[PDB]
Amino acid sequence: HHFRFQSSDPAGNPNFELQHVFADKVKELTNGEVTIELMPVGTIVDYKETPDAIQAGLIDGHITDTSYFAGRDPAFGLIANPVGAWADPAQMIDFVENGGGKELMNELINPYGLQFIGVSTPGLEAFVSKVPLDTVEDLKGVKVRSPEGLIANVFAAAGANPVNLPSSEVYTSLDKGVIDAADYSVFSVNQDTGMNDIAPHPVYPGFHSLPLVEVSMNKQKWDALTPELQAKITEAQKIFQQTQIDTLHQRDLEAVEAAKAGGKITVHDWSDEERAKFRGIARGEWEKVAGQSEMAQKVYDTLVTYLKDKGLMAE
Ligand SMILES: [Zn+2]
Ligand SMILES: [Zn+2]
Ligand SMILES: [Zn+2]
Ligand SMILES: [Zn+2]
Ligand SMILES: [Zn+2]
Ligand SMILES: [Zn+2]
Ligand SMILES: [Zn+2]
Ligand SMILES: [Zn+2]
Ligand SMILES: [Zn+2]
Ligand SMILES: [Zn+2]
Numbered sequence: 085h086h087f088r089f090q091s092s093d094p095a096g097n098p099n100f101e102l103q104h105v106f107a108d109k110v111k112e113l114t115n116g117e118v119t120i121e122l123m124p125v126g127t128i129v130d131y132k133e134t135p136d137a138i139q140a141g142l143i144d145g146h147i148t149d150t151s152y153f154a155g156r157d158p159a160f161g162l163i164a165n166p167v168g169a170w171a172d173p174a175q176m177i178d179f180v181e182n183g184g185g186k187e188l189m190n191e192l193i194n195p196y197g198l199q200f201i202g203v204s205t206p207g208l209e210a211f212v213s214k215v216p217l218d219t220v221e222d223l224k225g226v227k228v229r230s231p232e233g234l235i236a237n238v239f240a241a242a243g244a245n246p247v248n249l250p251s252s253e254v255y256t257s258l259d260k261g262v263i264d265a266a267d268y269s270v271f272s273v274n275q276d277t278g279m280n281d282i283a284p285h286p287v288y289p290g291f292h293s294l295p296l297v298e299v300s301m302n303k304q305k306w307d308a309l310t311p312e313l314q315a316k317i318t319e320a321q322k323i324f325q326q327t328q329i330d331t332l333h334q335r336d337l338e339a340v341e342a343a344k345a346g347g348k349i350t351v352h353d354w355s356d357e358e359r360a361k362f363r364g365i366a367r368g369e370w371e372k373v374a375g376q377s378e379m380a381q382k383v384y385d386t387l388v389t390y391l392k393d394k395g396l397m398a399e
Contacts, residue, residue, distance in 0.1 A: 085117065085118045085119070085305075085309070085313075086118075086119050086121065087118065087119070087120050087121070087144035087145055087301060087302075087305065088120075088121045088123060088128070088143045088144050088145075089106075089107075089120055089121065089122055089123065089143065089144060089145040089146055089147055089299075089301070090123045090124075090125065090126075090127055090128055090129065090131075090134055090137070090143050090145075090146050090147075090148070091103055091122060091123065091124055091125055091146070091147045091148065092125050092131055092146070092147065092148040092149050092152070092297070093124065093125055094124045094125055094126075095124045099206050099297075099328070100122075100124060102324070102327060102328045102331060103122055103147050103324065104122060105323060105324040105327045105328070106120060106122070106147065106299065106320055106321055106323075106324035107119070107120035107121070107122045109319070109320035109323045109324060110316070110317055110320040112320075113316040113317075113319055113320050114313060114316050114317075117313065118309075118313055118316070118317065120145075122147075123143070128142060128143050129142065129143065131148065131152060132152050132153070132155075134146040134148055135153070135193070135196045135197070135198055136196075138196075138197065138198055138300070138301065138302045139196060139197030139198065139302060139303075141302070144301055144302050144305060145198075145201075145299070145300055145301030145302065146298070146299075146300060146301075147204070147297060147298070147299050148297065148298060148300075149164065149295060149296075149297055150163065150164035150189075150295075150296045150297070150298045151164035151165055151295060151296075157192070157377050157379050157380065158373050158376040158377050158380045159188075159192060159377055159379035159380040159382070159383045160192065161233070161234065161373070162234070162370060162373045162374070162380050162383050162384065162387075163185065163188060163189070163192070163296065163383045163387075164295060164296045165234070165235075165293060165294065165295050165296065166234075166366070166370055166383075166387055167234045167235050167238045167292050167293060167366050167369070167370075168238055168291065168292050168362045168363050168365070168366030168367075169294075169363060169366065169387065169391065169396075170208060170294040171208075171289055171291065171354075171356075171359050171396075172208060172289060173205050173207070173208055173294065173329045173332075174329075175394075175396070176203070176205065176294055176296065177203060177325065177329075179387070179390050180202075180203045180296075181202075181203075183386070183390040183393075183394075184386040184389075184390065185203070185386070185387075185390075186200060186202070186203075188379075188382065188383055188386055189203075189298065189300075191379070191382070192379060193298075193300060194303060197302065197303050197304070198300045198301065198302065198303055199300060199301055199302070199303040199306040199307070200298055200299075200300045201298075201299045201300055201301060201306075201317060201318060201321050202298075202299050202318060202321035202322060202325060203296055203297070203298060203299070203325065204297045204298075204299060204321075204324060204325045204328050204329075205294060205295060205296060205297055205328070205329065205332075206270070206295055206297060206328075206332070207269075207270040207294070207329075207332040207336075208270070208289055208290050208293070208294040209267065209268070209269055209270055209290045209292070209293040209294070210268075210269075210270060210271035210274050210286055210287065210288040210289065210290040210336070211265065211266075211267070211286060211287035211288070211290050211291065211292065212254070212258070212265060212266040212267075212268050212274050212279045212280065212283050212286060213226070213264065213265035213266075213283055213285045213286060213287060214258060214264050214265065214282070214283040214284070214285060215264050215265065215285060216285045216350065216352070217265070217285060217287055217352060217354075218352055218354065218355075218358070219354075219358050219361075220242055220358055220361045220362050220365060223239065223242045223243060223244045224242070224243035224244065225243065225244070225245065226244045226245065226264045226265050227244075227245045227247050227262070227263045227264045227265070228244045228245065228246055228247065228263065228264070228265045228266060228267070229246075229247050229248075229249050229254050229257065229263045229265070229266035229267055229268075230244075230246035230247065230248070230266075230267055231248075231267060232248060234369060234370075234373065235267055235292065235293060236248070237369045237372075238292065238365065238366045238369045241365050241366070241368055241369050242362070242365045244265075247262065247263050249262075249263070251268070254266050254268055254279070255277065255278060255279065255282065258279070258282050258283050259282055264283075265283070266279070266283075267292070267293060270332060270335075270336060271286065271288050271290075271336040271339050271340060272332075272335040272336050272338065272339040274286065274339075275339035275340075275342065275343055276339065280343050280349050281346075281348075281349070284348050284349045284350060285349075285350050285352060286343070286349065286350075286351055286352065287351075287352045287353075287354060288336070288340060288351050288352070288353065289353065291354055291358075291359055291362050292362070292366075299321050299324070359396075360396060360397055360398065363391060363396060363397045364397060364398055367388065367397065370384050370387070370388075371384060
């Protein structure tokens with residue numbers, strides 16, 4: 085079997101490169117009986133149309149940002165990045181693999197002719213801040229660069245003042261005082277960009293943005309495989325997932341070490357209690373999204389049940 089998968093990332097991009105692990109491990113684990121051809125974003129079709137292309141047989145799968153499909157159903161946006169839910173990728177991965185998330189993903193994408201194989205992420209983002217934030221209360225009044233939608237709405241619910249800016253304007257806007265803090269990227273990027281130098285109170289691990297990248301394929305083709313090959317492909321995906329998370333973690337740790345060694349940057353790790361408080365604020369916004377569709381309510385119910393059960397949110 086030879087299956088062509090389209091990525092949401094371009095050639096060159098470090099996450100695209102990490103995705104080679106999925107293809108390589110599928111070939112290794114199946115001793116060649118299944119091969120994956122990994123294609124950069126836009127090779128065969130538009131990044132928002134990969135589901136269509138998969139069910140049609142034009143490509144066989146994708147590795148992509150599930151938030152791209154929020155237009156189909158708000159549930160997609162909510163499950164892809166339930167702002168504030170996670171303090172580490174392991175939490176989200178456990179939610180998917182053992183807490184009902186994978187079943188939700190298949191309920192969402194089987195109707196499009198896709199089988200959800202497994203989850204990955206480009207990383208839990210770190211927060212950029214010029215002002216010292218150790219509690220949720222510290223967010224009140226802070227001008228925070230926030231993407232439109234659930235991220236901005238959660239920061240507003242926390243009493244912050246969201247500001248809408250392109251990524252390329254964040255650095256100068258901090259310097260000029262237009263913003264005091266920002267959503268940007270993972271710590272290693274924030275650090276490399278000089279963000280933490282001009283805004284010397286980052287929060288790491290971050291507390292608000294952890295995007296879900298799905299690995300999914302044509303469900304008819306999936307269903308035609310033997311159990312042992314399905315298990316090997318799921319295994320390959322898990323290996324890719326773990327290699328990606330560990331690689332991201334190491335790069336962040338490198339950057340944090342450099343930040344701390346300079347003696348000026350204070351890296352704040354919010355307590356479990358403060359993170360649980362942030363979940364509670366965010367939950368009010370998740371619930372608004374939950375009311376927008378049946379599947380969004382199901383995502384909300386499953387997520388909140390998981391968080392309460394794990395002691396991550398007030399019972
Ligand atoms: Zn404080
Ligand atoms: Zn971000
Ligand atoms: Zn670097
Ligand atoms: Zn500097
Ligand atoms: Zn076969
Ligand atoms: Zn690690
Ligand atoms: Zn080091
Ligand atoms: Zn911690
Ligand atoms: Zn506290
Ligand atoms: Zn439990």
